[PDB]
Scaffold this active site. Sequence first.
Site, PDB file in Angstrom:
ATOM      1  N   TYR B  64      19.578  16.564   5.736  1.00 11.36           N
ATOM      2  CA  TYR B  64      20.072  17.905   5.387  1.00 11.36           C
ATOM      3  C   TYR B  64      20.681  18.626   6.591  1.00 11.36           C
ATOM      4  O   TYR B  64      21.359  19.601   6.390  1.00 11.36           O
ATOM      5  CB  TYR B  64      18.986  18.771   4.722  1.00 11.36           C
ATOM      6  CG  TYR B  64      18.706  18.357   3.328  1.00 11.36           C
ATOM      7  CD1 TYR B  64      19.307  19.003   2.270  1.00 11.36           C
ATOM      8  CD2 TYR B  64      17.811  17.336   3.056  1.00 11.36           C
ATOM      9  CE1 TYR B  64      19.057  18.640   0.958  1.00 11.36           C
ATOM     10  CE2 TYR B  64      17.561  16.940   1.750  1.00 11.36           C
ATOM     11  CZ  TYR B  64      18.187  17.608   0.709  1.00 11.36           C
ATOM     12  OH  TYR B  64      17.955  17.261  -0.592  1.00 11.36           O
ATOM     13  N   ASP B 149      17.981  28.007   1.115  1.00 11.52           N
ATOM     14  CA  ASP B 149      18.217  26.567   1.272  1.00 11.52           C
ATOM     15  C   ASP B 149      19.534  26.298   2.007  1.00 11.52           C
ATOM     16  O   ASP B 149      20.489  27.047   1.897  1.00 11.52           O
ATOM     17  CB  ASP B 149      18.287  25.892  -0.100  1.00 11.52           C
ATOM     18  CG  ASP B 149      16.927  25.671  -0.744  1.00 11.52           C
ATOM     19  OD1 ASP B 149      15.922  26.121  -0.181  1.00 11.52           O
ATOM     20  OD2 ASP B 149      16.905  25.048  -1.829  1.00 11.52           O
ATOM     21  N   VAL B 150      19.588  25.159   2.706  1.00  6.67           N
ATOM     22  CA  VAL B 150      20.694  24.842   3.547  1.00  6.67           C
ATOM     23  C   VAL B 150      21.839  24.120   2.835  1.00  6.67           C
ATOM     24  O   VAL B 150      22.980  24.144   3.326  1.00  6.67           O
ATOM     25  CB  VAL B 150      20.231  23.966   4.752  1.00  6.67           C
ATOM     26  CG1 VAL B 150      19.896  22.525   4.339  1.00  6.67           C
ATOM     27  CG2 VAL B 150      21.268  23.991   5.853  1.00  6.67           C
ATOM     28  N   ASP B 151      21.560  23.454   1.705  1.00  7.60           N
ATOM     29  CA  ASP B 151      22.559  22.660   1.005  1.00  7.60           C
ATOM     30  C   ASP B 151      23.457  23.494   0.111  1.00  7.60           C
ATOM     31  O   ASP B 151      23.627  23.246  -1.091  1.00  7.60           O
ATOM     32  CB  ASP B 151      21.919  21.496   0.239  1.00  7.60           C
ATOM     33  CG  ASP B 151      20.882  21.898  -0.768  1.00  7.60           C
ATOM     34  OD1 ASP B 151      20.334  23.020  -0.724  1.00  7.60           O
ATOM     35  OD2 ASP B 151      20.634  21.053  -1.645  1.00  7.60           O
ATOM     36  N   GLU B 241       8.416  26.610  -5.263  1.00  5.29           N
ATOM     37  CA  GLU B 241       9.076  27.471  -6.247  1.00  5.29           C
ATOM     38  C   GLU B 241       8.140  27.915  -7.346  1.00  5.29           C
ATOM     39  O   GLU B 241       8.211  29.029  -7.847  1.00  5.29           O
ATOM     40  CB  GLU B 241      10.324  26.780  -6.802  1.00  5.29           C
ATOM     41  CG  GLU B 241      11.058  27.568  -7.900  1.00  5.29           C
ATOM     42  CD  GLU B 241      12.341  26.875  -8.282  1.00  5.29           C
ATOM     43  OE1 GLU B 241      12.321  26.038  -9.214  1.00  5.29           O
ATOM     44  OE2 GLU B 241      13.357  27.109  -7.627  1.00  5.29           O
ATOM     45  N   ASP B 264      25.487  26.964  -9.051  1.00  2.00           N
ATOM     46  CA  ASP B 264      25.964  25.587  -8.917  1.00  2.00           C
ATOM     47  C   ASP B 264      27.147  25.431  -9.890  1.00  2.00           C
ATOM     48  O   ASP B 264      26.963  25.322 -11.091  1.00  2.00           O
ATOM     49  CB  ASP B 264      24.835  24.615  -9.239  1.00  2.00           C
ATOM     50  CG  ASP B 264      25.255  23.158  -9.050  1.00  2.00           C
ATOM     51  OD1 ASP B 264      26.445  22.857  -9.205  1.00  2.00           O
ATOM     52  OD2 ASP B 264      24.406  22.334  -8.693  1.00  2.00           O
TER      53      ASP B 264
END
Lengths: 283, 283
Positions: B64, B149-151, B241, B264
């Site tokens: 990642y 989150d990094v993605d 989560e 997304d």
Amino acid sequence: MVSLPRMVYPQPKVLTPCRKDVLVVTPWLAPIVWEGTFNIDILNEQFRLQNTTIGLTVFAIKKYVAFLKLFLETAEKHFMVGHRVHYYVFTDQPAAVPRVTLGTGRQLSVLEVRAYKRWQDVSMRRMEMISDFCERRFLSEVDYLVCVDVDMEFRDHVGVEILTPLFGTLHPGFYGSSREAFTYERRPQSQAYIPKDEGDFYYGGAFFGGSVQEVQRLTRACHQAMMVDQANGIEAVWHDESHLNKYLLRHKPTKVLSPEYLWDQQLLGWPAVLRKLRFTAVP
Amino acid sequence: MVSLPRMVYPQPKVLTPCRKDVLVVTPWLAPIVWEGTFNIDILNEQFRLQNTTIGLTVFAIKKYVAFLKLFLETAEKHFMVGHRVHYYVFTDQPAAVPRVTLGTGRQLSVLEVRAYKRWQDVSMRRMEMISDFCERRFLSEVDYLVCVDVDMEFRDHVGVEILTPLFGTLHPGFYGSSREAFTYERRPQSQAYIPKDEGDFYYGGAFFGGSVQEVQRLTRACHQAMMVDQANGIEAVWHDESHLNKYLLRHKPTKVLSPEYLWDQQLLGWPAVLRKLRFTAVP
């Protein structure tokens, strides 16, 4: 805060507006409180778990003492029921304060007002005295202060949905009006001056509040601005209401109450956009 | 806070909803942040006058780390532009952190993650480390923390409109779903358990935040709940989560971000109800 218990209530509907006919959040992301925007069971839980105490201030001078009985009786039926309440009745006639029976957890103090020979000091008295008492009593005694006019009655629920660091209330004469029609002070010589191209809302002087700290800040600022105006030989068009409006323009409230919370049915009827008439003028 | 300067902007329209297609305030009077609900000029003024610093935490482990370059470059274009920002990049490969050029008032720290042989300690690592660092650095360095989150990449504005004591973000897979379809942990043996008749929203673990104090509380609670589950030999269905969702059910967030903030496009397209796609999955 501490955790809520399990509760069963209807799921919020992300793709259904809670109102389709009114603005429910200001452009600075303060809720505008209308019926249909809140679940009072959730809010009551939140505030009760914090053992919240609400102070209510009211001034009753000269013939306005006649309004206290109905004001207090209806507050017992509708104002913060289930929560701790402390009423602070500021009056020039302590002996004229009616003996109203209170529910458990609710108390009343009578405070005598400083007599003034100058109408100027009387005009400034509410902001001055509220500010002064935020130090003498309120900081120690209550978590929030609600500051209202006495010539009014509660007809329906007024509860913890209003509580927030700083709130104002939409004046019932102007909620549908353009800002150029708002009766702000328009003379640049006054500290309360607001130009024709500024303004969010016209807030009513008859119903404002917040945390004790924010109310102390508001009332001190308004008092100090009124003293400047007095020195400069100007009285704002709507007195402390004009200064309240200048303050809330430049210090945005963290909630705004809809006119459900400040109404006059004789002058304005009962429009469809008002699902409830909560706090109203006495005929 | 301190007073705002004079500003010229359109008057709020009390009798016009800011959105007619979505819920813009929760039943506990938390704003739900969608395009059209806020005037960013007002909000920028409020937060700049408070000289707000925002911390952004991101974990980049194993492969990642490849996502960091785009993540940081796009954060420079869209995240809190004009405000003070401190990025905290938690990684197992400090040498793999790309050299990204930052705007003035913006800084980046690299923190090496505790290596763990147990997948269990890795599952708990983000909540544990965020909680721990709320003490080591964040309380002294920032006013708010944003944990993501990094993605992902920033495609449009993400700014001070999100800032509040505690926020969660509507997961893009569930914003239109009934609560019984939410993928909460459903086994009563887990600390993260939520019954079928409870729940407000399904919040995404990929974007949450708040004041440092509230984030410390959230992350400590989730960490401690995950340790209980580990002792009891249960792993919640969606890991941290699931615990985030249990925490925010019982401690209501003071803002909720719409799926504009967590999207997304490959999986979900660009529905009409999304006026902006702000923070999105990388294909």
